[PDB]
Amino acid sequence: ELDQLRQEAEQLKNQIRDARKACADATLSQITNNIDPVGRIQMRTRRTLRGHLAKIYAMHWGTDSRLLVSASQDGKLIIWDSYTTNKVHAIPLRSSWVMTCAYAPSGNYVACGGLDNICSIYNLKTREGNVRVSRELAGHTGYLSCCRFLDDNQIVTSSGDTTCALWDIETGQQTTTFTGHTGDVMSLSLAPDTRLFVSGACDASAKLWDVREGMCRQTFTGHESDINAICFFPNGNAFATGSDDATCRLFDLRADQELMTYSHDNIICGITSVSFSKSGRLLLAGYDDFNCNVWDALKADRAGVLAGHDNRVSCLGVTDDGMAVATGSWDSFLKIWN
Amino acid sequence: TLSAEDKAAVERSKMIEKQLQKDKQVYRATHRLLLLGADNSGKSTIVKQMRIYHQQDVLRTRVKTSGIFETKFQVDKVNFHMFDVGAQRDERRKWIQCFNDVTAIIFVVDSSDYNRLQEALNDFKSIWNNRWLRTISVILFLNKQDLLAEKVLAGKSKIEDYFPEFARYTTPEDATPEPGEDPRVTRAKYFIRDEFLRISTASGDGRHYCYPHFTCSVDTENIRRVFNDCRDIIQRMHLRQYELL
């Protein structure tokens, strides 16, 4: 009965709220406002990669901190070389609408996706010295948002049909499907041990999934608008979300409650990309004001501006060793900072 | 052999650069459109009659997927691309950001079903004021003009029932009606046109405009009209860089 289920849902929500309140004792910022801040940090561009025509939606660093791949709306996939700014490969795309890309851990495969509901995987160890689409994946009923390789034979995809699934490269079927979201999933990030991952959707709520079984372990709320990006802490026990309400927040899996609320007064723009650093201390983010503010972890105060882009910033990433920091915007340019 | 290896790589970078240089002049020589309508608006039919303007390849039919691009139809020796969105979900407030640099947006309105006319009116207002779709002009098509006639001619009409503003509406003097038409049908035909035009008046200042047209189900001048409107759009953009407008 609807009415019966109404009281059950209300009681469950009240119990969850009471459990959250019981575990809360004091705020972290007020109880630890003694340590010195990191100061003001400034970067400057060192390399500027050119060649793309239209805007750029995604990019991914390699596992050697020397090769990176970028996807643009012009329909071209380009593999760069940050050391000498010399291109290596240029793979034309079957469809001109691409919204995501990925790099294999072994440096032998890539991925792409967009408005077309098919994910394409390309091989870079070909005998003919060229490139060839090996496998294509079908089954989603919505535009793809993000995809990250897990190994040489598994991949995780996100789509706009409120579903997430895990595929098999050798033979293409949905080995596991994760359902429960209400809005469209926008981003996801795999854990360092490839045991769990999180994904935010267009419902102001996040979730945690188990790649093995497929159950939704935890769910977190707090935001007041759509979730646009999500990252993963290097330790494997935290993540940050950037929404369209011009606010940034941090969550802890064990605490199950938000800790930091990074905000300001004069900024009204939605977050577009979020990434951490090697030390888990310098959180980088994108904005609609054509900037990329470097915020902190415990400081909570923009301590660096990455101005220099004349259009919207859509993608952001950092190397595994942290030596270089890359960026990309809608002006079809890439910049590398130090 | 550092130089030798570096030379191999430099040579490679120059090869993958000539291809990009060749593709740059092809990318900028075509126009991208975005056609979107309603479930019952004649959208499909219009897309089907542009086919007449454009183991090998024959009737390429792939899997049921999204982003159904048309026949790369072209007219007057210039290429046009049109993207008919399909097989998507109801919500469209997120993927609409992709078409922020298209030449124009084609909007099709079913001006024969009075019931949902007002619900179609809102979508045009929402797309007009969007921040991303703020410098992109829109082309308006009023489809199914034949069915309108019958309506006003039958009994059960009452077009001021869902719109009690028709009572005082007088036909504009500038209105050029077609020779051999009826006064009643001229009043109804032009009373819907300025409904959409009033929304376009707000947030104007020459940033973008709207072009209305009285199209039909089997009209063959659509590709002409689109070409003329795109030509008008391109010319106005160039003049604004020389501060002439």
Epitope: S225, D226, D244 | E91, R93, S126, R131
Partner: nanobody
């Protein structure tokens, strides 16, 4: 999460001068656009009226004009939807709608099938 609550609906004598008030929590009420959406039985969703951020700009659906009123109230965090001169077709379910983005005058997905920031709805009858 974000929860929207409305009340005042039910069964009442014709010409009862119904009261419709929307309760909001979990977000800043002074930063979003408020709309009104109705779903009559036997057909889909319909849009009725909208209000500006500060209540300046006001628009109405052509069918119902000069019989309904809207009043955004920031201090009390309620809405005023007094009405009169009922019609037999007015029997429907009213849903309190919201706007996903702040600091913006327009936003889609107000009449979507599976929207999120929409009220639970109340039943009214003549």
């Amino acid at each position: 999460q974000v929860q929207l609550q409305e009340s005042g609906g039910g069964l009442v004598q014709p010409g009862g001068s119904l009261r419709l008030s929307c309760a909001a929590s979990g977000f800043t009420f002074s930063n979003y656009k408020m709309n009104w959406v109705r779903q009559a039985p036997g057909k889909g969703l319909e849009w009725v009226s909208d209000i500006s951020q500060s209540g300046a700009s006001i628009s109405y659906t052509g069918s119902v004009k000069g019989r309904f009123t809207i009043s955004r109230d920031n201090a009390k965090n309620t809405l005023y939807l007094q009405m009169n001169s009922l019609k037999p077709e007015d029997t429907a379910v009213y849903y309190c709608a919201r706007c996903p983005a702040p600091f913006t005058r327009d936003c889609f997905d107000v009449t979507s099938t599976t929207y999120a920031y929409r009220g639970q709805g109340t039943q009214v009858t003549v």
